[PDB]
RNA sequence: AGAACCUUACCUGGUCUUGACAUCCACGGAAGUUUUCAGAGAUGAGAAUGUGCCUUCGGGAACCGUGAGACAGGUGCUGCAUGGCUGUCGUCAGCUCGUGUUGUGAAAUGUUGGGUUAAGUCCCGCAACGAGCGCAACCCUUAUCCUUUGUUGCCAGCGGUCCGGCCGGGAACUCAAAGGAGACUGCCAGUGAUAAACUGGAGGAAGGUGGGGAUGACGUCAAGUCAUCAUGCCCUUACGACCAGGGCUACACACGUGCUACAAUGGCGCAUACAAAGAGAAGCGACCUCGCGAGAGCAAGCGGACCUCAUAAAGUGCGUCGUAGUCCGGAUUGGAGUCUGCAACUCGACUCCAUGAAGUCGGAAUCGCUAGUAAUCGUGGAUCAGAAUGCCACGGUGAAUACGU
């Protein structure tokens, strides 16, 4: 089975990507597993915002890396190649792994 | 046939199932006395049942995750209450009166930059 | 505070006897949020006390409390140049609390070994009308009496 | 202290110098900066002027000084008294 | 240093990001560095061309730049002569295949950054700062800004004691997150010192 | 930071890049309990001979824009101050002010 | 958001001077690759390979070498020349403007007054009428529900069992995200000026801004920062650059902020339960073997809801100690060692064995906190080779009190 790990910072974008991937899968092949949402990584950062000194003065940023696990149960001739061909929107790291 | 209610309190998440029976309580494949060493916890889990005389009438299977002991107990109680509500739907008023239907929304307040804790400010001095 | 009075928060009764007062006492006793240990101690105190005086566990405790409750306490107004301590009739909710607190203090003070034992001893003293808490109460009363002119 | 498996530490150059001295049989003081160098059995008898940051201070090596380092016998700070 | 940055507070809601790519902790810093480089280069090059926003977007080991500029004609030059030239240098800077797109900025009086730049330029060529500010404000208003604020600070008219002056017109709500507040800044490196120019331009509120 | 400092850092990095294979090998040799004493000694001495700037524990992480040694962040390769600026500008992808 | 070296800006010596870092020509050499002796090292002297993209051949672009200067360089001075960024009063409810009107005018009015509010919040009046910046709302998070999607997450009901959700499976529940619903004084009664509101109650997971965060008006302090950065006199064979060692860790003393204690609500021993949130490829490192232990060896699983860090601790049960400077307390020092690292002397952390200071709740005075708060208990992260009792995060247990001004 082809497991697909979509990773992105924007959630909407990721969602869009996932849908597209599903569409790509579903026309060619059959029995797409589904878009399973894994836990989001909220990598936080604190920094001092003064140039020199004021320690209680701080900004707390974060990067929300979202995960989408799409799986394809039956890899056909037409489907996998189609998937390979299909480039998704920018800012969405997709990894594809069969078996 | 088994009825159900979800329990939640602090970071605990109880899964209470109500069935008709003799009144044996199992929490994560352990007895009430085994799982909760604390008397208070036991009391809290039995409270709703005590309030509405169905201690002997119904068995309940529970599995709980997260939080500590007291929190877990609270969650369990909540779950039980929910189950009761589902099952009878005419005991609601009593439950409300008791204060068990209410999800206790008190979470731990986050630590805040500047402060040592949620509210403890560090030691001040003019000089 | 200035703006708004607020409703006192809900307190659960203790599992052994099913009492609010007892629970409150236990809470008062407690330190570092170690409630369980404190409650155990309280229970121990009760049991010993019960053994000593007969009666029940709860009833005896109540009796003990009764001998250390203050009718009247004082407060500092200080409107003049020098300070005037003024007596005030201390309300039902507060009086009960105060007695408990005093008892706890006495227990803490006491030279006996285990905490629970000390507590029990204190309770016994209260029941009999000697000891530390009782003395404190008397002092409080005495002060009020002295300053009865102010009202 | 240093691990036993690693052995003792001595600066290579210093060691070489010591060897040379031994070969010669001379007793002119060897000025050295390697304060971190451990003293060796063969160094006994030699005067070796160890740097203290500022100046080279002469250290006549003895049987008792072997396990120690050269910087131990060349104090850097110079405190007499507050009054 | 009272105020929060108006762009920065709104990135999740009404404002988008400039650099728009994903990368793991391994390659992220490098990517950032690359972005910084390319942007810097672009600024250096297209100073005379009125450039507002460089948007970098790298999918599949290939960098896509998008230059928002008021006058494409100067940035493009002859059709695909200057752009092409830019591209190879961009690629070199990155170390990947480059692709430059050029968005045409409609209404450069309403683009805040551009306005700021203009103001700075004016300052440099020794105009009355106040008159410049007025012009900036007025023009934006004319163009259909719901509001605009501009602020200039330090060594104004070469005066020994530095001060800040600012002109607002219309409404410029900063606490309101849903407000499209185009904020940007610039610096006039005059004979007496630097003169910092801030400008806020309120396009309107977004409803979603 | 100064230019000079930056240059030094760069040099150090270069050295590290150069001498990694050898240094690592030497380290391995030194570690290896199943080995000759003399060999080990040689390795130890060999290491000393190699340049100091060849060590990776010599090089300090500085900001990639300003060269500021302190307040550094690894993910961004930037000092706090610059990082913040980047965030404000929209230049760091995904990064926005966090509240919870 | 981490001084052994580095960092480092300081000291001591040893050295360099178009230079460590750039651009420019001139012309000597392909770059680079390997290795040798002296030196603390910086540097100062040797042996091997190569000639790629193109020439009516006066040669070129990358990358070393030398000399000239143009210049580089400066964590040098001025934050009282500046920008940017920051603190602060203060998340205090304020601060203004246009037009009108009043006053010779500075100014006033609006913005005051009656009520009310967390709020210049809202209503009513009124020479004001309007507007803006702020107080509110929009944003994140947390509390309830629903829909969607179910692996690496889940196990209610089914069969099988090595009694492990592990394996058939199931999509219920938890959980995971994505999208919706929900709270508005909307509904009820009374008080109120026919009001804005207030007081209570009904429902509800939540009630009157539900809890928390982000958000900081005009301005103030010639507040802080020229040593992040940028930027408007001074040094330029040295106030620049390279190096090794030392210092930033000094110690009659005074202050600030913390940790650990002084014990029995405890210490010690044995058993045993319940988290959350994070990090991880020059990385996290199971299992197994060895070591009293720090660790060592071997070495899977894993860019990770999968594997690893990783046993939560307080707690609970049973035993012991019995108020002692103690089986409290752990400083200090001796020995021996482990790991990181070219390198632990100055000056790392941790381990083992020994050693066992002061300290029995602290003078004048002084700080924090109104709830999942304080108090207490552990856990993680950043910087980081190594080096936290600090900082930033996470959950556990969990109070007291608020009469009032």
mmCIF file of C-alpha atoms in Angstrom, chain E residues 9-195:
data_model
loop_
_atom_site.group_PDB
_atom_site.id
_atom_site.type_symbol
_atom_site.label_atom_id
_atom_site.label_comp_id
_atom_site.label_asym_id
_atom_site.label_seq_id
_atom_site.Cartn_x
_atom_site.Cartn_y
_atom_site.Cartn_z
ATOM 1 C CA UNK E 9 0.329 40.415 14.177
ATOM 2 C CA UNK E 10 -1.911 39.700 11.121
ATOM 3 C CA UNK E 11 0.039 36.926 9.279
ATOM 4 C CA UNK E 12 -2.413 34.208 10.378
ATOM 5 C CA UNK E 13 -5.552 36.147 9.371
ATOM 6 C CA UNK E 14 -5.629 38.931 6.764
ATOM 7 C CA UNK E 15 -1.969 39.286 5.721
ATOM 8 C CA UNK E 16 0.004 36.469 4.012
ATOM 9 C CA UNK E 17 3.688 35.483 4.276
ATOM 10 C CA UNK E 18 6.404 36.564 1.827
ATOM 11 C CA UNK E 19 8.622 33.462 1.913
ATOM 12 C CA UNK E 20 6.190 30.580 1.298
ATOM 13 C CA UNK E 21 7.847 27.168 1.562
ATOM 14 C CA UNK E 22 8.142 24.110 3.770
ATOM 15 C CA UNK E 23 11.428 22.691 5.009
ATOM 16 C CA UNK E 24 12.621 20.418 7.813
ATOM 17 C CA UNK E 25 14.926 21.679 10.608
ATOM 18 C CA UNK E 26 17.909 20.528 8.482
ATOM 19 C CA UNK E 27 17.472 22.820 5.462
ATOM 20 C CA UNK E 28 15.420 25.668 6.975
ATOM 21 C CA UNK E 29 18.194 27.988 8.131
ATOM 22 C CA UNK E 30 19.986 27.620 4.803
ATOM 23 C CA UNK E 31 16.773 28.416 2.943
ATOM 24 C CA UNK E 32 16.255 31.511 5.077
ATOM 25 C CA UNK E 33 19.811 32.640 4.365
ATOM 26 C CA UNK E 34 19.261 32.147 0.639
ATOM 27 C CA UNK E 35 16.062 34.184 0.799
ATOM 28 C CA UNK E 36 17.879 36.970 2.627
ATOM 29 C CA UNK E 37 20.613 36.968 -0.006
ATOM 30 C CA UNK E 38 18.322 36.989 -3.046
ATOM 31 C CA UNK E 39 16.074 39.665 -1.549
ATOM 32 C CA UNK E 40 19.102 41.808 -0.738
ATOM 33 C CA UNK E 41 20.373 41.432 -4.290
ATOM 34 C CA UNK E 42 16.989 42.368 -5.723
ATOM 35 C CA UNK E 43 16.757 45.474 -3.547
ATOM 36 C CA UNK E 44 20.226 46.532 -4.682
ATOM 37 C CA UNK E 45 19.338 46.018 -8.334
ATOM 38 C CA UNK E 46 15.812 47.318 -8.582
ATOM 39 C CA UNK E 47 16.229 50.463 -6.471
ATOM 40 C CA UNK E 48 15.365 52.784 -9.373
ATOM 41 C CA UNK E 49 12.469 50.466 -10.234
ATOM 42 C CA UNK E 50 9.670 50.953 -7.692
ATOM 43 C CA UNK E 51 9.562 47.515 -6.003
ATOM 44 C CA UNK E 52 7.169 46.793 -3.103
ATOM 45 C CA UNK E 53 7.216 43.083 -2.227
ATOM 46 C CA UNK E 54 9.491 40.164 -3.173
ATOM 47 C CA UNK E 55 7.626 36.887 -2.618
ATOM 48 C CA UNK E 56 9.847 33.778 -2.608
ATOM 49 C CA UNK E 57 8.288 30.353 -3.083
ATOM 50 C CA UNK E 58 10.438 27.233 -3.586
ATOM 51 C CA UNK E 59 8.877 23.865 -4.546
ATOM 52 C CA UNK E 60 10.852 20.788 -5.701
ATOM 53 C CA UNK E 61 14.464 22.105 -5.607
ATOM 54 C CA UNK E 62 13.584 25.158 -7.729
ATOM 55 C CA UNK E 63 13.119 28.765 -6.555
ATOM 56 C CA UNK E 64 10.104 30.820 -7.727
ATOM 57 C CA UNK E 65 10.512 34.563 -7.082
ATOM 58 C CA UNK E 66 7.592 36.961 -7.535
ATOM 59 C CA UNK E 67 8.517 40.660 -7.705
ATOM 60 C CA UNK E 68 5.671 43.090 -6.988
ATOM 61 C CA UNK E 69 6.671 46.349 -8.711
ATOM 62 C CA UNK E 70 4.841 49.543 -9.762
ATOM 63 C CA UNK E 71 6.617 49.766 -13.139
ATOM 64 C CA UNK E 72 7.377 46.336 -14.704
ATOM 65 C CA UNK E 73 8.742 48.039 -17.852
ATOM 66 C CA UNK E 74 11.988 49.099 -16.146
ATOM 67 C CA UNK E 75 12.390 45.725 -14.330
ATOM 68 C CA UNK E 76 11.660 43.759 -17.530
ATOM 69 C CA UNK E 77 13.455 46.249 -19.826
ATOM 70 C CA UNK E 78 13.250 44.780 -23.329
ATOM 71 C CA UNK E 79 10.892 41.766 -23.415
ATOM 72 C CA UNK E 80 12.717 39.000 -21.511
ATOM 73 C CA UNK E 81 16.188 40.608 -21.512
ATOM 74 C CA UNK E 82 16.506 42.041 -18.008
ATOM 75 C CA UNK E 83 14.272 39.488 -16.293
ATOM 76 C CA UNK E 84 16.319 36.672 -17.818
ATOM 77 C CA UNK E 85 19.530 38.307 -16.616
ATOM 78 C CA UNK E 86 18.097 38.626 -13.116
ATOM 79 C CA UNK E 87 17.072 34.976 -13.129
ATOM 80 C CA UNK E 88 20.512 33.447 -13.622
ATOM 81 C CA UNK E 89 21.972 35.594 -10.849
ATOM 82 C CA UNK E 90 19.092 34.587 -8.570
ATOM 83 C CA UNK E 91 19.782 30.941 -9.376
ATOM 84 C CA UNK E 92 23.462 31.428 -8.583
ATOM 85 C CA UNK E 93 22.578 33.047 -5.269
ATOM 86 C CA UNK E 94 20.293 30.139 -4.415
ATOM 87 C CA UNK E 95 22.176 27.232 -6.020
ATOM 88 C CA UNK E 96 19.027 25.929 -7.780
ATOM 89 C CA UNK E 97 16.909 26.549 -10.919
ATOM 90 C CA UNK E 98 15.351 30.037 -10.698
ATOM 91 C CA UNK E 99 12.039 31.406 -11.985
ATOM 92 C CA UNK E 100 11.189 35.130 -11.794
ATOM 93 C CA UNK E 101 7.600 36.369 -12.049
ATOM 94 C CA UNK E 102 6.741 40.101 -12.043
ATOM 95 C CA UNK E 103 3.415 41.282 -10.583
ATOM 96 C CA UNK E 104 2.285 44.763 -11.661
ATOM 97 C CA UNK E 105 1.316 46.937 -8.669
ATOM 98 C CA UNK E 106 -1.934 48.798 -9.396
ATOM 99 C CA UNK E 107 -2.053 52.140 -7.502
ATOM 100 C CA UNK E 108 1.502 52.709 -6.138
ATOM 101 C CA UNK E 109 0.163 55.590 -3.979
ATOM 102 C CA UNK E 110 -1.841 53.037 -1.941
ATOM 103 C CA UNK E 111 1.126 50.654 -1.525
ATOM 104 C CA UNK E 112 2.688 51.692 1.768
ATOM 105 C CA UNK E 113 6.261 50.555 1.201
ATOM 106 C CA UNK E 114 6.448 52.345 -2.137
ATOM 107 C CA UNK E 115 5.134 55.533 -0.548
ATOM 108 C CA UNK E 116 7.728 55.270 2.211
ATOM 109 C CA UNK E 117 10.477 54.805 -0.361
ATOM 110 C CA UNK E 118 9.273 57.855 -2.273
ATOM 111 C CA UNK E 119 9.273 59.911 0.917
ATOM 112 C CA UNK E 120 12.812 58.776 1.703
ATOM 113 C CA UNK E 121 13.936 59.742 -1.791
ATOM 114 C CA UNK E 122 12.357 63.169 -1.388
ATOM 115 C CA UNK E 123 14.122 63.636 1.940
ATOM 116 C CA UNK E 124 17.433 62.673 0.355
ATOM 117 C CA UNK E 125 16.976 65.310 -2.396
ATOM 118 C CA UNK E 126 16.405 68.029 0.237
ATOM 119 C CA UNK E 127 12.696 68.815 0.163
ATOM 120 C CA UNK E 128 10.594 70.022 3.078
ATOM 121 C CA UNK E 129 9.806 66.767 4.873
ATOM 122 C CA UNK E 130 6.422 68.079 6.005
ATOM 123 C CA UNK E 131 5.322 68.906 2.397
ATOM 124 C CA UNK E 132 6.411 65.403 1.318
ATOM 125 C CA UNK E 133 4.410 63.842 4.139
ATOM 126 C CA UNK E 134 1.363 65.888 3.166
ATOM 127 C CA UNK E 135 1.722 64.781 -0.446
ATOM 128 C CA UNK E 136 1.956 61.154 0.643
ATOM 129 C CA UNK E 137 -1.124 61.419 2.785
ATOM 130 C CA UNK E 138 -3.183 63.407 0.296
ATOM 131 C CA UNK E 139 -2.391 61.174 -2.661
ATOM 132 C CA UNK E 140 -3.385 57.999 -0.834
ATOM 133 C CA UNK E 141 -6.653 59.605 0.247
ATOM 134 C CA UNK E 142 -7.374 60.644 -3.331
ATOM 135 C CA UNK E 143 -6.693 57.113 -4.541
ATOM 136 C CA UNK E 144 -9.306 55.620 -2.169
ATOM 137 C CA UNK E 145 -7.513 54.581 1.022
ATOM 138 C CA UNK E 146 -9.972 54.206 3.905
ATOM 139 C CA UNK E 147 -7.135 55.843 5.825
ATOM 140 C CA UNK E 148 -3.391 56.477 5.936
ATOM 141 C CA UNK E 149 -0.863 57.465 8.573
ATOM 142 C CA UNK E 150 2.748 58.461 7.945
ATOM 143 C CA UNK E 151 5.460 59.204 10.495
ATOM 144 C CA UNK E 152 8.951 60.653 10.063
ATOM 145 C CA UNK E 153 11.578 60.859 12.763
ATOM 146 C CA UNK E 154 14.978 62.325 13.560
ATOM 147 C CA UNK E 155 17.133 65.246 12.383
ATOM 148 C CA UNK E 156 14.198 66.868 10.555
ATOM 149 C CA UNK E 157 15.484 69.900 8.646
ATOM 150 C CA UNK E 158 18.989 69.055 9.918
ATOM 151 C CA UNK E 159 18.020 70.234 13.410
ATOM 152 C CA UNK E 160 20.318 69.371 16.317
ATOM 153 C CA UNK E 161 17.488 68.113 18.536
ATOM 154 C CA UNK E 162 15.831 65.173 16.785
ATOM 155 C CA UNK E 163 12.055 64.786 16.774
ATOM 156 C CA UNK E 164 9.207 62.825 15.218
ATOM 157 C CA UNK E 165 6.234 64.198 13.316
ATOM 158 C CA UNK E 166 3.308 62.305 11.835
ATOM 159 C CA UNK E 167 0.239 62.897 9.670
ATOM 160 C CA UNK E 168 -2.900 60.775 9.822
ATOM 161 C CA UNK E 169 -5.931 61.021 7.559
ATOM 162 C CA UNK E 170 -9.077 58.892 7.565
ATOM 163 C CA UNK E 171 -9.147 55.942 9.976
ATOM 164 C CA UNK E 172 -6.190 53.597 10.680
ATOM 165 C CA UNK E 173 -7.311 50.941 13.195
ATOM 166 C CA UNK E 174 -4.295 48.923 14.405
ATOM 167 C CA UNK E 175 -5.896 46.980 17.286
ATOM 168 C CA UNK E 176 -8.503 45.607 14.852
ATOM 169 C CA UNK E 177 -6.939 42.375 13.505
ATOM 170 C CA UNK E 178 -9.307 42.044 10.514
ATOM 171 C CA UNK E 179 -8.224 45.482 9.193
ATOM 172 C CA UNK E 180 -6.034 45.315 6.061
ATOM 173 C CA UNK E 181 -3.252 47.551 7.372
ATOM 174 C CA UNK E 182 -0.433 47.729 4.830
ATOM 175 C CA UNK E 183 2.468 48.810 7.025
ATOM 176 C CA UNK E 184 6.032 49.465 5.927
ATOM 177 C CA UNK E 185 9.168 51.441 6.714
ATOM 178 C CA UNK E 186 12.184 53.161 5.117
ATOM 179 C CA UNK E 187 15.342 55.158 6.013
ATOM 180 C CA UNK E 188 16.673 58.409 4.481
ATOM 181 C CA UNK E 189 20.462 58.523 4.810
ATOM 182 C CA UNK E 190 20.733 62.319 4.753
ATOM 183 C CA UNK E 191 23.761 64.577 5.357
ATOM 184 C CA UNK E 192 22.687 65.181 8.984
ATOM 185 C CA UNK E 193 21.861 61.504 9.686
ATOM 186 C CA UNK E 194 19.177 58.877 9.145
ATOM 187 C CA UNK E 195 15.484 59.824 8.931
#
